[PDB]
Design a protein around this ligand. Structure first.
Ligand SMILES: [Zn+2]
Ligand SMILES: [Zn+2]
Lengths: 195, 114, 16, 196, 87, 130, 144
């Protein structure tokens, strides 16, 4: 479906171009296979992110990475890629609003769940490759509030930093006050604990 | 510096000397095709390589959100205050923390260094 | 896609 | 020595099922691009950049003796894991290897050769950008370059081999009965255990 | 893996064709999975619950079936095509 | 620092900015206008050019910075080259008056003709020691 | 035997109060950290304007790294010294350190004042991402 959509758009297939046009255009890869080229990469990436965030032809786990410096758009769809959900940020504002929180408070007897959050285009799955092209806010409460500017262009925001931890390291109370080798030692001993 | 190709097989023209006239000719091998070589320079290599990065910088990096933006330096082609600044971060752009600057204004991909 | 079969459509050929 | 670097450092390519690295331009001519301009058009996209040209000069010079697709195919076939005793077998084997083993994700049909050529050009182009220091060397442990085979892909990996074994087994059974001139029952042909 | 990859692995496998004489062809088309089932000493299917598998040292597995189309050509410009369902 | 420079290995490539193989068939003339001046300063007296010098030219630029840092001067590099290659290479050098430290090299007038100079360049840049 | 039995009368512990410094000490540590960050920004600005000159024997990256590394090291040890001066005589960390029974002065400084620079293979944290240590920073950021 990705190839069909790009063919529907102005992506020029490699078979139908002279090599003279490759220098000033952006190469398009799909699962590492160079499909074709495209001459306006920015609006293309905007369209692809729009389709993914709406759960259109592009599914959520598909990852689009734009290397601007090298003029490449690599789209990945295969399995084995790791990703995680990040809240989408637009004009230094979360797309998450109080209405979504109210709907999630009545998660029961409303049939509003995480999948509707993804479908609403508020949270999206970002993989470690696409993280290189992401400017991420640690917490919305301060990192994107107006002040002496550090970065005024945030693309995503973490849900909670504590989710970087695994399973056995997340039962540590106050792990950020410990020496890290002892966090590791507890991550083993919790596996070894009786219960 | 110049690279030239044949007109019948489009293979690489190798420089050659006609000593009968003491003239340089960019001749095609395996095609007996010859041209008047007028570049008069057959090899060069910039071992110093102070090559410009503003040539290598692509203006589309103005669209990058992860890059730093500043108002300290307005553009010199449109006067736009905002500009994106970064380093070469490349070999033969040898070790130097200097900043190259790109005008953030669309349709003005002006590059400079301070 | 792979079809599912119910246990009543499994003939007793595995015993024969 | 004295003349090895006089031409300069060049680009070689090692392919699957070949016991010897082959020059890259030989591979391009084997794909069916004999004109140097046609090859460099797939390799270098900005012809106004002399540095890339000077990078690719000695690679062209090494492969200059070969100037035809059939000659390059014979060159590749002579260096194969099981070289053809005759030129026809060498060219056929090299053609099969380039058809099926060299960059199969690009394609396996012959008409994808152009795509393969472009991809191979891109590969060497990336190498040049590493040699000229215009792009950073990719980091092996950068986790974005990793994939995790879970129960799904792993069980698929096993099931492919086991299904191959099952089909080979039923082939042997059916051919046992066919060479004997009689018909075979399909149920007895299947050794279930080969999967189970 | 179950829903998609098994079907694709069987389908993209090469068709078998053999000769000594009559030509034979075989083709796998469609795949079926029952639920995890246990066959007793008499051979009676019953739904195997996983706890029984834990206790009795069984394997919590489900049987796999495939429709096999055999097309035999007896070098007379005829093709007899018989389809064994749920093999 | 003088002794440090005396023992630390310096090769030709360390002090060179760039090179270029020109053709320049008439050695009285130069393809580079700035070259012609001091080339004429070395060509009022014939120096192994009465017979036909090889009609190739290998022109190298030496970094003023590294030349001053290593306490190197124009003449002793030419002495080292002539020692390494005898009179097989006729070597001329610009007078030390500007940062453009130019050294011209040609094959002897008793003399591949062209890529042999490329071999000589690839040799001298790395293995030759100043 | 004798000292272990006298310790039942004396007794020895370690608690949160032994890791707490007065408000003045925290203000001093924060002022030291602010000064260190400000002069690191000064060094970065000198480097960006090509005003920083390389030392003999080191490239410009090495010169910059040496400058910022010594800056953060002196900041860390100054903060640790100030925290050590804030220790009371009843402070159990100091009791266990001066006796040599366990720990070191660096441990007290890390617990009280500043954990300090984190190093990988003897260098600051490298750019794993594209010119970044994490996605939460901007590219080409050499701050502490
Ligand atoms: Zn020709
Ligand atoms: Zn501008």
């Amino acid at each position: 479906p990705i190839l069909e959509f790009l063919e529907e758009w102005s992506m020029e297939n490699l078979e139908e171009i002279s090599p003279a046009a490759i220098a000033d255009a952006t190469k398009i890869f799909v699962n590492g296979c160079w499909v074709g080229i495209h001459k306006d990469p920015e609006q293309l990436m905007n369209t692809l992110r729009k389709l993914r965030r709406q759960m259109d032809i592009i599914v959520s786990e598909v990852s689009m990475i734009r290397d601007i410096r090298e003029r490449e758009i690599r789209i990945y769809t295969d399995a084995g890629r790791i990703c995680r959900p990040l809240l989408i940020v637009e004009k230094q504002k979360l797309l998450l609003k109080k209405r979504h929180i109210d709907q999630l408070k009545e998660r029961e007897y409303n049939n509003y769940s995480w999948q509707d959050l993804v479908a609403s285009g508020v949270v999206e799955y970002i993989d470690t490759l696409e993280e290189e092209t992401v400017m991420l806010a640690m917490t919305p409460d301060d990192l994107q509030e107006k002040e002496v500017a550090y970065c005024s262009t945030y693309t995503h925001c973490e849900i909670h930093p504590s989710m970087i931890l695994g399973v056995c390291a997340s039962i540590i109370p106050f792990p950020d006050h410990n020496q890290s080798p002892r966090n590791t030692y507890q991550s083993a001993m919790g596996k070894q604990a009786m219960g | 510096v110049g690279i030239r190709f044949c007109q019948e097989c489009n293979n690489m023209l190798y420089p050659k000397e006609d000593k009968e006239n003491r003239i340089l000719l960019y001749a095609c091998r395996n095609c007996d095709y010859q041209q008047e070589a007028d570049n008069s320079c057959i090899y060069v290599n910039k071992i110093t390589h102070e090559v410009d990065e503003l040539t290598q910088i692509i203006a589309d990096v103005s669209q990058d959100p992860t890059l730093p933006r500043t108002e300290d330096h307005p553009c010199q082609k449109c006067g736009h205050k905002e500009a994106v600044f970064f380093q070469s971060h490349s070999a033969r752009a040898e070790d130097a923390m200097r900043l190259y600057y790109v005008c953030t204004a669309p349709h003005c991909g002006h590059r400079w260094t301070e | 896609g792979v079809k599912l079969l119910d246990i009543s459509e499994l003939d007793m050929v595995g015993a024969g | 020595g004295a003349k090895k670097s006089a031409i300069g450092q060049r680009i070689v390519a090692t392919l699957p099922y070949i016991k010897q690295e082959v020059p890259i331009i030989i591979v391009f001519r084997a794909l069916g691009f004999v004109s140097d301009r046609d090859i460099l058009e797939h390799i270098i996209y900005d012809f106004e950049d002399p540095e890339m040209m000077e990078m690719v000069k000695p690679s062209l010079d090494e492969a200059f003796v070969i100037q035809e697709q059939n000659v390059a195919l014979n060159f590749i076939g002579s260096r194969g894991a099981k070289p053809g005793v005759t030129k026809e077998k060498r060219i056929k084997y090299a053609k099969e290897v380039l058809q099926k083993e060299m960059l199969p994700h690009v394609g396996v049909s012959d008409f994808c050769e152009t795509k393969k050529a472009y991809f191979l050009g891109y590969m060497v182009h990336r190498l040049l950008l590493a040699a000229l220091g215009r792009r950073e060397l990719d980091d092996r442990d950068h986790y974005g370059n990793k994939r995790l085979d879970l129960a799904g892909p792993l069980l698929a990996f096993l099931f492919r081999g086991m299904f191959k074994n099952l089909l080979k087994e039923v082939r042997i059974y059916a051919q046992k009965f066919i060479d004997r001139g009689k018909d075979f029952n399909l149920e007895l042909a299947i050794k279930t255990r080969i999967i189970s | 893996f179950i829903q998609m990859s098994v079907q694709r692995i069987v389908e993209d496998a090469p068709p078998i064709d053999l000769q000594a004489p009559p030509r034979y062809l075989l083709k796998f088309e469609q795949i079926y999975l029952s639920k995890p089932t246990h066959w007793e000493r008499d051979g009676a299917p019953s739904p195997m619950m996983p706890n029984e598998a834990r206790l009795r040292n069984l394997t919590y597995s489900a049987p796999l079936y495939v429709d096999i189309t055999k097309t035999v050509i007896k070098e007379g410009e005829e093709q007899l095509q018989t389809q064994h369902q749920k093999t | 620092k003088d002794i440090l420079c005396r023992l630390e290995h310096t090769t030709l490539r360390k002090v060179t900015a760039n090179t270029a193989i020109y053709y320049d068939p008439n050695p009285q003339s130069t393809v580079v206008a700035e070259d012609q001046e001091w080339v004429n300063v070395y060509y009022e007296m014939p120096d192994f050019d009465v017979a036909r010098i090889s009609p190739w030219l290998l022109r190298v630029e030496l970094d003023r910075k590294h030349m001053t840092d290593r306490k190197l001067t124009m003449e002793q590099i030419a002495e080292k080259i002539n020692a390494g290659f005898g009179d097989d290479l006729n070597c001329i050098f610009n007078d030390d008056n500007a940062e453009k430290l130019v050294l011209r090299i040609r094959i002897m007038n008793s003399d591949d003709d062209d890529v042999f100079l490329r071999c000589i360049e690839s040799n001298m840049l790395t293995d030759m020691t100043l | 035997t004798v000292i272990n039995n006298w310790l039942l009368i004396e007794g020895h512990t370690i608690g949160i109060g032994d890791s707490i410094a007065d408000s003045k000490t925290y203000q001093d540590i924060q002022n030291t950290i602010k000064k260190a960050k400000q002069d690191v920004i000064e060094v970065i600005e000198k480097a960006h304007n090509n005003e920083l000159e390389p030392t003999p024997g080191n490239t410009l990256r090495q010169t910059f790294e040496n400058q910022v590394n010594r800056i953060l090291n002196d900041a860390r040890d100054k903060t640790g010294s100030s925290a050590q001066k804030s220790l009371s005589e009843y402070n159990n960390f100091k009791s266990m350190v001066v006796s040599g029974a366990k720990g070191s002065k660096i441990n007290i400084s890390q617990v009280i004042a500043v954990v300090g620079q984190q190093n990988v293979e003897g260098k600051r944290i490298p750019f794993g991402f594209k010119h970044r240590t994490l996605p939460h920073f901007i590219k080409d950021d050499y701050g502490p």
